[PDB]
Amino acid sequence: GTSVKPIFSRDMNEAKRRVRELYRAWYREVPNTVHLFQLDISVKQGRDKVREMFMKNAHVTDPRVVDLLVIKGKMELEETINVWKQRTHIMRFFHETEAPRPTDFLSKFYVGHDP
């Protein structure tokens, strides 16, 4: 029951199919992105980052949430392909000027009060 209306997919199988299609499109786009934006990363780095972004949301079990995630990923792909994005936008995925924040207890205790 729970009486919900879908966006595109009726169960997780169709949602997974759409996820795979979007992943294929991003995988094909990465080399062109590296060429056009004149990025100093490799194609391997770009595809690894695409996989990491996809795996960030691997725990989702709602087909509607997956449909919205695919819609957002398609929005980002359309944005990248048309060059609406600049090199700064593409490089924002890699956080190159962010100092690594530690995760163990002792370093956090040393730096400050935040957990």
The residues that touch another protein, with contacts defined as CB under 8 A, are 1-7, 10-11, 56-57, 60-65, 68-69, 71-72, 75-76, 78-79, 82, 84-89, 91-92, 96-98, 112-115
Look-up of token digits 């029951």 = 1
**Smallest separation (angstroms) from another protein to the CB of 60:** 6
Nearest distance in Å: CB 8, another protein: 9
Q: Which is nearer to another protein, 25 or 60 (CB)?
A: 60
In the complex, the smallest distance separating the C-beta of residue 101 from another protein, rounded to whole angstroms, is 8
Radius of gyration in angstroms for the set of CA atoms belonging to the chain, rounded to a whole number: 18
| Ramachandran angles phi, psi of 83, nearest 5° | 65, 25
Question: CA-to-CA distance for 28 and 20, rounded, in angstroms?
Answer: 12
Pick between residue 24 and residue 72 the one whose CB is nearest to another protein. 72
* Complex with another protein: residue 27 or 38, whichever CB lies closer: 38
Residues 6+ apart with CB under 8 A from 93: 49, 53
For the CB of residue 13, give the shortest distance to another protein in the complex, in Å: 12
- If we measure between CA atoms, which residue out of 63, 98, 93, 62 comes closest to residue 76? 93
